[PDB]
mmCIF file of C-alpha atoms and ligand atoms in Angstrom:
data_model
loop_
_atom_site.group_PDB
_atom_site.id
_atom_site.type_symbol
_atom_site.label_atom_id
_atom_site.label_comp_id
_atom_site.label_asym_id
_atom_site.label_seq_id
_atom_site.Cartn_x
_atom_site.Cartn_y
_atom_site.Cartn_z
ATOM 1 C CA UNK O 1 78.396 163.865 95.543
ATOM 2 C CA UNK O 2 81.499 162.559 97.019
ATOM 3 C CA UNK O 3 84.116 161.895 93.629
ATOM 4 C CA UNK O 4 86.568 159.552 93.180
ATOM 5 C CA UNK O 5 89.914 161.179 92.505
ATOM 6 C CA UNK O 6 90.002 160.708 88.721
ATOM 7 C CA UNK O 7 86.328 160.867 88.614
ATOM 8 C CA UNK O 8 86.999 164.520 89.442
ATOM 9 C CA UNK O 9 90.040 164.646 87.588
ATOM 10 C CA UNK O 10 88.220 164.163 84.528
ATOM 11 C CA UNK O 11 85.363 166.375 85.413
ATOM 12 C CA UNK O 12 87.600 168.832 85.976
ATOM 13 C CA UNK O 13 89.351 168.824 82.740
ATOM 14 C CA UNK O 14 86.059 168.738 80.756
ATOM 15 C CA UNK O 15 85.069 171.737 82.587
ATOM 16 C CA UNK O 16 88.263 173.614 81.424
ATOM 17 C CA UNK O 17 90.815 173.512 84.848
ATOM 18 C CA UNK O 18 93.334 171.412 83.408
ATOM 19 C CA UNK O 19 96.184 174.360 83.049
ATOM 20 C CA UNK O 20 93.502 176.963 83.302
ATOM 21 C CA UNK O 21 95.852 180.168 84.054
ATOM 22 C CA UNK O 22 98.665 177.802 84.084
ATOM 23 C CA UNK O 23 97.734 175.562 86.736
ATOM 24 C CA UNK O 24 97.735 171.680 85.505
ATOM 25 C CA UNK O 25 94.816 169.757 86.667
ATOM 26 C CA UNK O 26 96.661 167.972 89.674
ATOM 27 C CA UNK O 27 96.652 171.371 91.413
ATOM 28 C CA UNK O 28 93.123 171.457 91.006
ATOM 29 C CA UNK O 29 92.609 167.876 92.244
ATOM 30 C CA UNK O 30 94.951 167.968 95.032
ATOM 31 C CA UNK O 31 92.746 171.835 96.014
ATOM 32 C CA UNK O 32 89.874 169.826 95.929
ATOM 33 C CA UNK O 33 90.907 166.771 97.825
ATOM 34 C CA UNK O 34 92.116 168.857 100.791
ATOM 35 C CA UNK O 35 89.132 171.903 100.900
ATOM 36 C CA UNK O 36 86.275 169.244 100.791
ATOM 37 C CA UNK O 37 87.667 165.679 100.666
ATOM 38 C CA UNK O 38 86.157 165.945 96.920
ATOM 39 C CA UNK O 39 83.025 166.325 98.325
ATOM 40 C CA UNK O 40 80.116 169.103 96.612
ATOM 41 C CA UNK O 41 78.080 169.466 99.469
ATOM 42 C CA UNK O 42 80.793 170.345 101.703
ATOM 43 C CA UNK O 43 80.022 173.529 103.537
ATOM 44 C CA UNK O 44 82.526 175.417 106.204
ATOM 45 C CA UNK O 45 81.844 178.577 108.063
ATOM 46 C CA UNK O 46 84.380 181.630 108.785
ATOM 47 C CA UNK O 47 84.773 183.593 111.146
ATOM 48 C CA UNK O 48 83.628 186.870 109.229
ATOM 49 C CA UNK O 49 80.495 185.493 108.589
ATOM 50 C CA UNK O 50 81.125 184.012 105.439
ATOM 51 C CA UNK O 51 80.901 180.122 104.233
ATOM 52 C CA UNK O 52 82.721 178.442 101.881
ATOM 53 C CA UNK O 53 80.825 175.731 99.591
ATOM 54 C CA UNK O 54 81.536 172.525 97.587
ATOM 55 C CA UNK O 55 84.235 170.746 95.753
ATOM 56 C CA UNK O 56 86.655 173.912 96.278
ATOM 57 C CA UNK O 57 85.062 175.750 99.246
ATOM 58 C CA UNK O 58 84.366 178.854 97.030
ATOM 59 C CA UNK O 59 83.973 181.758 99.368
ATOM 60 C CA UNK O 60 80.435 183.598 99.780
ATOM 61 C CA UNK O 61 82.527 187.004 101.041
ATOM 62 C CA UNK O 62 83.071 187.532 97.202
ATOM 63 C CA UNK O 63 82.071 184.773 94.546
ATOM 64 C CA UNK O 64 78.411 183.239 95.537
ATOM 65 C CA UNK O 65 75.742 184.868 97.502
ATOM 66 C CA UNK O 66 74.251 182.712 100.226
ATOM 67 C CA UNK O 67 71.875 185.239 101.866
ATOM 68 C CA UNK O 68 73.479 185.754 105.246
ATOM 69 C CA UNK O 69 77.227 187.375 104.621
ATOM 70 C CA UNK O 70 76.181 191.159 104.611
ATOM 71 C CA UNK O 71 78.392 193.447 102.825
ATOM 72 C CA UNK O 72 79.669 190.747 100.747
ATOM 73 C CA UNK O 73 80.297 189.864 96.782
ATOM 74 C CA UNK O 74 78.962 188.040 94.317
ATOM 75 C CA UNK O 75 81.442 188.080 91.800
ATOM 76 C CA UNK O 76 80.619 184.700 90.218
ATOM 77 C CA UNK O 77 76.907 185.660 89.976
ATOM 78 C CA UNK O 78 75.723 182.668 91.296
ATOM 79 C CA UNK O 79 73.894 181.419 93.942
ATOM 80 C CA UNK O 80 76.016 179.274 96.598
ATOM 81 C CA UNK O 81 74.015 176.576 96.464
ATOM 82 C CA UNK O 82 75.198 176.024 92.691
ATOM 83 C CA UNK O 83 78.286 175.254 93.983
ATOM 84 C CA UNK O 84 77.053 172.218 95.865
ATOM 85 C CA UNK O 85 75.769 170.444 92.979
ATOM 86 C CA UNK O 86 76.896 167.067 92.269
ATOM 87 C CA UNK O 87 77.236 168.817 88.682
ATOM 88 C CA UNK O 88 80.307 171.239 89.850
ATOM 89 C CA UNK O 89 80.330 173.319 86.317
ATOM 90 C CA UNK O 90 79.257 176.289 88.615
ATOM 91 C CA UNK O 91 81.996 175.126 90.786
ATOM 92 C CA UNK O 92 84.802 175.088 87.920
ATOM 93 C CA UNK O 93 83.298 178.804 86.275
ATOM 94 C CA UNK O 94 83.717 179.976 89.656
ATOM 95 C CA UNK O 95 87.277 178.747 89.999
ATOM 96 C CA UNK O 96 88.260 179.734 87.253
ATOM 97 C CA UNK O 97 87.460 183.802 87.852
ATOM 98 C CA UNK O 98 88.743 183.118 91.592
ATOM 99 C CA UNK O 99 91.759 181.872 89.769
ATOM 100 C CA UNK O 100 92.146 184.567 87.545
ATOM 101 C CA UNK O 101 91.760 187.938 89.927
ATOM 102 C CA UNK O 102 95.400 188.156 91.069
ATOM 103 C CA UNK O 103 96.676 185.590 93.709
ATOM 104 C CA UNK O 104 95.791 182.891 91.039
ATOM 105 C CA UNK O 105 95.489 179.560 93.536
ATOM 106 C CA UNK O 106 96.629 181.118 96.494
ATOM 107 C CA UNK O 107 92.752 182.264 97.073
ATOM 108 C CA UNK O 108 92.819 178.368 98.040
ATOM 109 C CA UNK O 109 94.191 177.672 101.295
ATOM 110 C CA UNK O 110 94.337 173.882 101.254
ATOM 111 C CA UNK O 111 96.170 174.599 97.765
ATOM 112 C CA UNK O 112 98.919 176.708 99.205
ATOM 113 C CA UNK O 113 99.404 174.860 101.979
ATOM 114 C CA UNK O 114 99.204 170.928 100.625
ATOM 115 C CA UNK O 115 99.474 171.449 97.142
ATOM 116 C CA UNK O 116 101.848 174.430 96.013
ATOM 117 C CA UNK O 117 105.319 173.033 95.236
ATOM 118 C CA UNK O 118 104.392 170.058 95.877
ATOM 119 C CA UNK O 119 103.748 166.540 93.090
ATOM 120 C CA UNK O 120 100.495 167.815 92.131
ATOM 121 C CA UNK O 121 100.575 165.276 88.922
ATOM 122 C CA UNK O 122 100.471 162.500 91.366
ATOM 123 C CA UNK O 123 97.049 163.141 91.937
ATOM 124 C CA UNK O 124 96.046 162.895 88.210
ATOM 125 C CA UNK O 125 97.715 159.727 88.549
ATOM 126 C CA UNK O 126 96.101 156.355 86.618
ATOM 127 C CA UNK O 127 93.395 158.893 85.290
ATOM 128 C CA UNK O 128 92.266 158.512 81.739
ATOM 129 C CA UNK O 129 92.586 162.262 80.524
HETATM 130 C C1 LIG S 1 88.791 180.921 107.794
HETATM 131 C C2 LIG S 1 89.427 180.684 106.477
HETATM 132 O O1 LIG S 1 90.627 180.919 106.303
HETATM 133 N N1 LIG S 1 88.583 180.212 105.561
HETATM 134 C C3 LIG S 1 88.979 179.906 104.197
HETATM 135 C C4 LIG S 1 88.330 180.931 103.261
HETATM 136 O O2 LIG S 1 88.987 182.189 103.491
HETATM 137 C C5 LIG S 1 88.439 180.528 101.778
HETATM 138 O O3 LIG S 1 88.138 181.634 100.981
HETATM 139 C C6 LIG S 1 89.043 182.556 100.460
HETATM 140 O O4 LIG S 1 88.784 183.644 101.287
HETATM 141 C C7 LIG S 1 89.698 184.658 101.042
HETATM 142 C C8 LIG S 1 89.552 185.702 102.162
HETATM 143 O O5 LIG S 1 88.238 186.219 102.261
HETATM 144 C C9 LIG S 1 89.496 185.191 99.600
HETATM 145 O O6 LIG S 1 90.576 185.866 99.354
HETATM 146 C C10 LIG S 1 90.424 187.228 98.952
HETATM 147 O O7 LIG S 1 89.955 187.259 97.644
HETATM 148 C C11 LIG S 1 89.741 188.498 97.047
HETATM 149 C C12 LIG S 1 88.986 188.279 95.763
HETATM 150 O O8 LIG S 1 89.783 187.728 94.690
HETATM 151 C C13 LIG S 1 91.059 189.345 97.000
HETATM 152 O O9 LIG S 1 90.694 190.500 96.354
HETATM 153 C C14 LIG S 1 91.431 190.779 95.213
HETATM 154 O O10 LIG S 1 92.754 190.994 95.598
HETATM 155 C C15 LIG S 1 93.517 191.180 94.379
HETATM 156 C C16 LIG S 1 94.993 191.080 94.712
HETATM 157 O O11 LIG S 1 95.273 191.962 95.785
HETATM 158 C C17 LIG S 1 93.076 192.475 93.687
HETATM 159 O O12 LIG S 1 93.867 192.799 92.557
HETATM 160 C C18 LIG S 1 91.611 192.329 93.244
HETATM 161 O O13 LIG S 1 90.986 193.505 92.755
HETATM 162 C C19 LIG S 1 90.804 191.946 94.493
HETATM 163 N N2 LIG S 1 89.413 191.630 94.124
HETATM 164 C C20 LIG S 1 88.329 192.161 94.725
HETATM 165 C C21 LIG S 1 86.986 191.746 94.202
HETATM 166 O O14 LIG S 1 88.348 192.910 95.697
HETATM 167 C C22 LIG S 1 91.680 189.387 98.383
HETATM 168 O O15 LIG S 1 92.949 190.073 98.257
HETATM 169 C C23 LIG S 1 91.727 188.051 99.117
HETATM 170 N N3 LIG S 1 91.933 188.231 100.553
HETATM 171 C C24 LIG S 1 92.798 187.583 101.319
HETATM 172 C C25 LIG S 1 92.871 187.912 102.826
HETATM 173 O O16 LIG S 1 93.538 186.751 100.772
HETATM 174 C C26 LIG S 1 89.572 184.091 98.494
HETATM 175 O O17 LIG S 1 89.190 184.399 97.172
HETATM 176 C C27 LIG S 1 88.749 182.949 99.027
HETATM 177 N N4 LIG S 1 88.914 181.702 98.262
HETATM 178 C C28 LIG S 1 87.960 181.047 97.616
HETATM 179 C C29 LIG S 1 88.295 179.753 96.908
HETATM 180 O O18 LIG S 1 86.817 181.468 97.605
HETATM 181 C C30 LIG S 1 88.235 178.982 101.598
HETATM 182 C C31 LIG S 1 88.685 178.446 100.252
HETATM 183 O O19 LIG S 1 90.110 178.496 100.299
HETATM 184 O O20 LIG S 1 88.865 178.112 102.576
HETATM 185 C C32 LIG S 1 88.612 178.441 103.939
HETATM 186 O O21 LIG S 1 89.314 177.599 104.848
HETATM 187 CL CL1 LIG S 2 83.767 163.123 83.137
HETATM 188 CL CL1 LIG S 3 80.547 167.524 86.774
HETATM 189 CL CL1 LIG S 4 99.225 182.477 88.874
HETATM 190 CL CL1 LIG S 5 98.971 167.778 86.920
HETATM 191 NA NA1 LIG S 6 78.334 186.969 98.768
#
């Protein structure tokens, strides 16, 4: 499923992100718009081996297994296929221990680099929460 912006918005906040370890939902949104263009079934490949999976690219070197990133994690006990659901519960559980282990939402690339310090409330914008 590709979401509309407020369509994941308010996914997202029923799922628990909205200021989950502090972070208001428009980080979360803006994450998700730039890691898969709010897209579940997006899937990227890294150059350790690893892929990255759905709405926020959750990595398979520590949070999902995916069968073919030896030596890896699976710290969100969950296949990575859950995390291309159209359903992205899995998704927002993961995120939500990703967020929690230390760098909080710098574990997201697209978030440090197009969303930290940035208007992140812009992209809650309109939304009915
Ligand atoms: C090619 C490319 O850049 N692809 C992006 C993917 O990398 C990306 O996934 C993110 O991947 C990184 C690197 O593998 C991963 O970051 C690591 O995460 C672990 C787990 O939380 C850290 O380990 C913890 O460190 C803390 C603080 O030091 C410790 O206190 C804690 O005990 C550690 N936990 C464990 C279990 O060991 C690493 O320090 C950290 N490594 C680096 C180099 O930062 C992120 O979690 C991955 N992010 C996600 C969302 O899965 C993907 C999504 O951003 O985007 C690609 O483009
Ligand atoms: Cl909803
Ligand atoms: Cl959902
Ligand atoms: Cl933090
Ligand atoms: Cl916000
Ligand atoms: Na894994």
């Amino acid at each position: 499923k590709v979401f509309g912006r407020c369509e994941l918005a308010a996914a997202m906040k029923r799922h628990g992100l909205d200021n989950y370890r502090g972070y208001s939902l428009g980080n979360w949104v803006c994450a998700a718009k730039f890691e898969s263009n709010f897209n579940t079934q997006a899937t990227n490949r890294n150059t350790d081996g690893s892929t990255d999976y759905g709405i926020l690219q959750i990595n398979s070197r520590w949070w999902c297994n995916d069968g073919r990133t030896p030596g890896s994690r699976n710290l969100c006990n969950i296949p990575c296929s859950a995390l291309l659901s159209s359903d992205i519960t899995a998704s927002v559980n993961c995120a939500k221990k990703i967020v929690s282990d230390g760098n909080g939402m710098n574990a997201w690339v697209a978030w440090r680099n197009r969303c930290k310090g940035t208007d992140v409330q812009a992209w809650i914008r309109g939304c009915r929460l």
